[PDB]
Structure 1
Amino acid sequence: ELKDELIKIASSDGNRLMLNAGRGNPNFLATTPRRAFFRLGLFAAAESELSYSYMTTVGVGGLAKIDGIEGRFERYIAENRDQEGVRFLGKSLSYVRDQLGLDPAAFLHEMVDGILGCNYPVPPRMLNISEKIVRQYIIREMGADAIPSESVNLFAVEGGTAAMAYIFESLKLNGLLKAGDKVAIGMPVFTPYIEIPELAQYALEEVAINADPSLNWQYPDSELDKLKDPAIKIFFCVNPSNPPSVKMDQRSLERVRNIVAEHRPDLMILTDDVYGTFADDFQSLFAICPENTLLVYSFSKYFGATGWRLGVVAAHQQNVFDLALDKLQESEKVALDHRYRSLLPDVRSLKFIDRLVADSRAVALNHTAGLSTPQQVQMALFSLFALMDEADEYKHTLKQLIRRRETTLYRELGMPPLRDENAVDYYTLIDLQDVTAKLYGEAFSEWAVKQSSTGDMLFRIADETGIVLLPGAGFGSNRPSGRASLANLNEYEYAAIGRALRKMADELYAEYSGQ
């Protein structure tokens, strides 16, 4: 509720994004894979222009010809060696042809025809080579070191935002989730993911799997164990988490692996892993229980591409969603036979991830559904950018940047809180007791806590810096605390938040020092 008055004191689209959707829009962006996208376009347009047969000054192209594409492409690569984006395009060619072993002419054609976006995505679910390019990036950054590439299929959608909207709808229409079914949600999570299941169109009952502060926001075993209840149809999780911003740990990952393995082989897991790369040796639920999990991976935060709206829905070639589909009643299966009659002859063989594509645009419009070709191409380039960066220079650069900002934030707050291996810190929690105790001791700590309120703290900082933090969610109001993103502000702004919260601390301390 303090949210309404916070926005008033401080107004900026960013601050709103944080309070309305609960995300920090990044102030950083992968430039190289973008420059290449643009250079690939200039070359693409030339390829277009080569095919227009008439004399006009108006500016019309024909479709790029696949014949002799390598030769022209290479000629392009050579004449522009001093342009950042062209060198990348070139290496990228090598990687796809040489390391992945796909057809180079076909790769070039998919990329050129794609960024011209003069053709409907085909197949609808995701372009042929891009899927294979993007899936190798996914597996890797998800920690799926054992899953064979061919066993993983992707559906390219418009951000993780379109993902959740498409999944929940498909789960309802396909009777894999009905009103009354219990949904286990790893909490805390941001509001949008609490609201969706509660909507009247879904009417699902949620079961909190609560993260524990004492465990650095890991889900204790007793908590995970709740999934044993066979009534829980699915486990909705955001990992690494937002707001806590920590990745689930080993214990937690085996815990679930076992529950699924020995008690709930039928359970559906739905995990959102956008912050994965910001973690250290991330391993996704998808990697631990691939056959039971639907992955939603967005390129949004890692590449500073929120505006691009790029994400994928990944599913194992063999999974429980299709299983649950066969376990449906003849009567339900007969009605779905009508629903997808047009997609193909044997609807009982239509895999769930293909139903996601069909359902996203009413089905009758399948052949023209799918994420835009130019969008997919930019996705394919982000993927390549990561894969070819063997030393992880880009990843390290961002992680040291989050750290520099953290260093600046707590400079006057008693340095950052101790960081362990499960830490991500895309959002960092500024707790008043912990800051005061690190500055003036645990006595003053317990007394300062009682003297203020989250709103108090937030309002004051919002008033002295214009920056509005996110109230501390996760451990019973007992604790004054806010959350900041270490990805959306610049250093002097993190200096100001911390300078302000010191002054408040020096004041809280002056009071305590005179009785």
Structure 2
Amino acid sequence: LSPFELKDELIKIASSDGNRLMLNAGRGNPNFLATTPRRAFFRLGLFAAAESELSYSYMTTVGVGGLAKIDGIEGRFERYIAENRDQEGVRFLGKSLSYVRDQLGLDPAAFLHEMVDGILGCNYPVPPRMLNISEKIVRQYIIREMGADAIPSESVNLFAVEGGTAAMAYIFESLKLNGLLKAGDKVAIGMPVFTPYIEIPELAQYALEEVAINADPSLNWQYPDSELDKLKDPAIKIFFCVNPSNPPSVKMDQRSLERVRNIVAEHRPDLMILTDDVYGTFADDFQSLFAICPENTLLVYSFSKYFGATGWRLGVVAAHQQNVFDLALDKLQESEKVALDHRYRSLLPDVRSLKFIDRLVADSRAVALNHTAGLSTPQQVQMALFSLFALMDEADEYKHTLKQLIRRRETTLYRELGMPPLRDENAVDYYTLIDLQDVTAKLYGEAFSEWAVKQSSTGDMLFRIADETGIVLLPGRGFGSNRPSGRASLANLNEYEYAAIGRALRKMADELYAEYSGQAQNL
């Protein structure tokens, strides 16, 4: 049948917000979430409300408060912390003050006030790009989880945005407005990638040409040298990539990372790299292209999956202080610079000094509104708390818990399918590939496996499952329609449901085997 037609139909046999999200946005919404940093947030909120009431000078029963005062805040916070040792979030808050004060060396009072004033949401974000201390806390978390083990923290700047969704919207419009990406420009895209990232560059607002950098199934979905080398083409202005990938769900290996490193150093020092690494924490020793080529990369990191915070809309765009986007802006034609000089005039005197990452902020809200732009303060505070939570968990227990949960769901799913496929060191598996050829092969041998692959189709497979379980899987994309296969997220369902997907597929395979047995036995 057809791909962009099978999606429309599937949404029918099985309707659900989850199934629609998977089909409409190619995302698996996590059914788990970090609770400790959230309780810490709500508890910090009860402390901040008390701080606000201490500042309202008149008598009322209405419920009005003033701005929290920074003076003596460490004392009052410590009183609050001591008086509520038996509440989880509270213990967390208290330790987080120590982490910021003792391990990061920041001003403790400043920290508490930013969080307090922050969570009350009674002041416009300042600076608009990101709250001062929250920016330093979050980048510490970013640098660590991206495996950017060589980039000094002071060199990374962050722009807080409402998720990777806002991030991409911002980045594409800014690149276009600053003439760093013009129509007809070639944008290399790591493939396969989910639908959304294929349609923006296809928009008429941009009109970009796509150069596919196809992953190779026989290489466990890594990018082969020959494919990565396609970047040496000087006509390719930007490398758009999701890593760990979606849907293959694997992280680029060392080979692939070094490959790109060389390509940038010896052939393309002008190449712009745009990488979405939301799944990084689900991989084992993840390293981002941002860690490898910091000055050629705009890193888009979302807090959505790891923290089970898709609803909080929390993300950051990271850029190295010295980067190719500012250089390209420097190299624009005087003609163009004058034009930009008039766009960001109301911002600063020397518009030519205005950094790219800051134009992102300016651009996000029609420039003239730059001073009331930025992510809400309560969201930034929750973002910093999520960050502290991961940074303070030295033993990575939360991370181990989630990887163990993923694997438990995988074990349940492949119970009647011949056990889960062999794991690699690049395996992430937030999404898992259910390939009819591999399953039948494990169950009844290579011979049957080959016959089956010709008798069935992805449509057949997905329909059979959607029918018997109500779950709609993602068609397997990336390797010539010659292989019936679908994808499931191990992050959005419960055990018995995976158990049902498997049971449904084992039935399907036994049916094919019965047919195959009856046929060969007619020789």
Q: TM-score, normalised by structure 2?
A: 0.98
Distance 2:133 2:347 in 1: 22
Q: Deviations over 1:229-271 (max 9, x none)?
A: 0000000000000000000000000000000000000000000
Distance 1:228 1:191 in 2: 26
Helix, strand or coil for the counterpart of 2:190? strand
Helix, strand or coil for the counterpart of 1:307? coil
Moved more, 503-512 or 220-229: 503-512
Q: Deviations over 1:185-233 (max 9, x none)?
A: 0000011101001100101111000000000000000000000000000
Counterpart of 2:427 in structure 1 is 423
Helix, strand or coil for the counterpart of 1:58? coil
Distance 1:51 1:233 in 2: 54
Helix, strand or coil for the counterpart of 2:246? coil
Asked if 1:145 is matched to 2:149, the reply is yes
Segments of 5+ residues of structure 1 without an aligned counterpart are none
1:56-75 matched pairs, under 5 angstroms? 56-75=60-79
Distance 1:2 1:485 in 2: 19
Counterpart of 1:292 in structure 2 is 296
Distance 2:54 2:174 in 1: 43
Helix, strand or coil for the counterpart of 1:344? coil
Q: Deviations over 1:331-383 (max 9, x none)?
A: 00001001111111101110000000000000000000000000000000000
Question: What's the CA shift for 1:136?
Answer: 0.1
Helix, strand or coil for the counterpart of 1:202? coil
Distance 2:371 2:323 in 1: 25
Q: Deviations over 1:262-308 (max 9, x none)?
A: 00000000000000000000000000000100000000000000000
Q: Deviations over 1:447-469 (max 9, x none)?
A: 11111110100001000000000
Distance 1:297 1:380 in 2: 14
Counterpart of 2:111 in structure 1 is 107
Question: What's the CA shift for 1:390?
Answer: 0.2
Question: What's the CA shift for 1:324?
Answer: 0.2
Distance 1:433 1:422 in 2: 22
Question: What's the CA shift for 1:322?
Answer: 0.1
Count of equivalent residues: 514
Helix, strand or coil for the counterpart of 1:198? coil
Question: What's the CA shift for 1:34?
Answer: 0.2
Asked if 1:23 is matched to 2:35, the reply is no
Distance 1:219 1:503 in 2: 35
Q: 1:301 aligns with which of 298, 301, 305?
A: 305
Q: Deviations over 1:417-461 (max 9, x none)?
A: 000100000000000010000000001000111111101000010
Distance 1:203 1:499 in 2: 45
Distance 1:326 1:412 in 2: 60
Q: Deviations over 1:166-187 (max 9, x none)?
A: 0000000000000010000000
Distance 1:10 1:73 in 2: 51
Distance 2:432 2:329 in 1: 41
Question: What's the CA shift for 1:11?
Answer: 0.6
Distance 2:509 2:460 in 1: 13
Question: What's the CA shift for 1:165?
Answer: 0.1
Helix, strand or coil for the counterpart of 1:226? helix
Q: Deviations over 1:130-149 (max 9, x none)?
A: 00000000000000000000
Distance 2:277 2:125 in 1: 25
Question: What's the CA shift for 1:127?
Answer: 0.1
Question: What's the CA shift for 1:497?
Answer: 0.2
Question: What's the CA shift for 1:475?
Answer: 0.2
Distance 2:393 2:347 in 1: 40
Helix, strand or coil for the counterpart of 1:496? helix
Distance 1:512 1:150 in 2: 64
Question: What's the CA shift for 1:125?
Answer: 0.1
Q: 2:255 aligns with which of 235, 245, 251?
A: 251
Helix, strand or coil for the counterpart of 1:130? helix
Question: What's the CA shift for 1:4?
Answer: 1.2
Question: What's the CA shift for 1:35?
Answer: 0.2
Helix, strand or coil for the counterpart of 1:172? helix
Asked if 1:127 is matched to 2:131, the reply is yes
Distance 1:101 1:122 in 2: 21
Question: What's the CA shift for 1:513?
Answer: 1.0
Distance 2:505 2:254 in 1: 35
Helix, strand or coil for the counterpart of 1:479? coil
Distance 1:3 1:183 in 2: 26
* Percent identity of paired positions between Structure 1 and Structure 2: 100
Distance 1:427 1:331 in 2: 48
Distance 1:220 1:448 in 2: 29
Distance 2:415 2:53 in 1: 57
Distance 1:149 1:126 in 2: 15
Counterpart of 2:521 in structure 1 is none
Distance 1:297 1:343 in 2: 27
Distance 2:410 2:497 in 1: 11
Helix, strand or coil for the counterpart of 1:441? helix
Q: 1:34 aligns with which of 19, 33, 38?
A: 38
Distance 1:349 1:70 in 2: 38
Question: What's the CA shift for 1:507?
Answer: 1.0
Q: Deviations over 1:376-401 (max 9, x none)?
A: 00000000000000000000000000
Helix, strand or coil for the counterpart of 1:237? strand
Counterpart of 2:59 in structure 1 is 55
Distance 2:35 2:377 in 1: 20
Question: What's the CA shift for 1:505?
Answer: 1.0
Counterpart of 2:458 in structure 1 is 454
Distance 1:421 1:453 in 2: 30
Counterpart of 1:215 in structure 2 is 219
Distance 2:512 2:221 in 1: 28
Distance 2:153 2:9 in 1: 50
Asked if 1:82 is matched to 2:86, the reply is yes
Distance 2:103 2:190 in 1: 38
Question: What's the CA shift for 1:411?
Answer: 0.6
CA RMSD of aligned residues (A): 0.4
Helix, strand or coil for the counterpart of 2:201? helix
Q: Deviations over 1:484-508 (max 9, x none)?
A: 0000000000000001100111111
Helix, strand or coil for the counterpart of 2:503? helix
Distance 1:488 1:249 in 2: 26
Question: What's the CA shift for 1:5?
Answer: 1.2
Distance 2:147 2:270 in 1: 23
Distance 1:107 1:392 in 2: 25
Helix, strand or coil for the counterpart of 2:223? coil
